[PDB]
Design a protein around this ligand. Sequence first.
Ligand code: NDP
Length: 404
Amino acid sequence: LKDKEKAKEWERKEAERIEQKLERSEKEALESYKKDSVEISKYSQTRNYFYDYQIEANSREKEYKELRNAISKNKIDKPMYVYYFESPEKFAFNKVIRTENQNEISLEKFNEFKETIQNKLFKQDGFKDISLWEPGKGDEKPTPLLMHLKLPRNTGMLPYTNTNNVSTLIEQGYSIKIDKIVRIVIDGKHYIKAEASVVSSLDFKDDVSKGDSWGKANYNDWSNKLTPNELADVNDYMRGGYTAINNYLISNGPVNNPNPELDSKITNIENALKREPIPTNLTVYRRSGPQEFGLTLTSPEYDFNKLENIDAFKSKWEGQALSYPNFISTSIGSVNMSAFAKRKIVLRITIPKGSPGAYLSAIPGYAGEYEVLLNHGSKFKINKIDSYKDGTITKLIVDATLIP
Ligand SMILES: NC(=O)C1=CN([C@@H]2O[C@H](COP(=O)(O)OP(=O)(O)OC[C@H]3O[C@@H](n4cnc5c(N)ncnc54)[C@H](OP(=O)(O)O)[C@@H]3O)[C@@H](O)[C@H]2O)C=CC1
């Protein structure tokens, strides 16, 4: 736990042991990592949001895949705790816990951080260097926030040597919940120690073929579980009826201009989506237009190239609920597509096991790929908003959870 001498000796011994296992290509990727860790780790966070050809061609993509593979071949046989420092902004606490010159963290700030991270899951992605022991009076402590994360059995972990130093690499690909926070003292300064655990979610990211295999496996027989009316209304919807149905819902037609024929279709589609609930925690992706967030294509606020507009968007939406009156299309894949080339908001949604939903792309012939349809009137809790550059265009990733 705080046993530095033990963990470093073990870590070094393990590094030198694993080094004999690695493929030449993996050793090559590791050599590159030692030289360019910041940019490779950043790449590993957002690589999957670009086009397939951008992914393929990227100067860091082969390095990513090799490092990914190497990490996976050293799986832990029991659960293990790891330590790493984190920015409070990572958990949507968009301010300092204390300045780096200050020693103390006020009770108010401690409690405010607690309230911010409560009852939320946060998606974690990309390579990370971690420590096996609690950083002490002699280590690099770049932030007032120290994560103490329990990694589950069979998590990949790669100890490696870098000059005279030893580090351990993981690839994050899960959500975390912060179960407890405690104010600790290290070398005369207060830190927040956050006790965290992993919650898993099936997340294909750019691997649309595996996602499709899963979707069809789970929804090939979905049509056969529907009544004649349900199947006919789902068909109508997928064949182009979605426009009239969703416009009616968005404009609150059921109240202001009731159409009982449409009401019936909506009821049938909802029952169809409740017929075979999402069988596991699943991550889906939606490329959202401005109107879904109360903006238009010509809103000055939609220009996320200006930092002011990101801060304004976060202030409005982060930690808040978002509800769609219409049925919501999403994809199992995170890749950009020509149809949504310039859309600036990526909704990254965790669907809890048992939620209404269906993999529509399992229906034969249907011209539409990798699609998961969610129920009308769905509510989404926004945990965290991130930004990234897509060429010259700043885009946003909205980490949300589908809630009751
Ligand atoms: N978007 C995605 O990532 C995915 C889309 N699909 C399917 O691909 C096709 C084209 O995609 P898309 O353009 O999204 O078509 P959609 O029918 O999903 O949306 C059409 C327009 O309606 C606007 N809109 C949607 N919901 C709301 C809302 N609640 N409030 C206000 N405005 C809203 C959108 O934003 P705005 O007007 O600001 O641009 C969009 O321009 C559709 O058949 C869709 O079902 C399948 C998988 C994923």
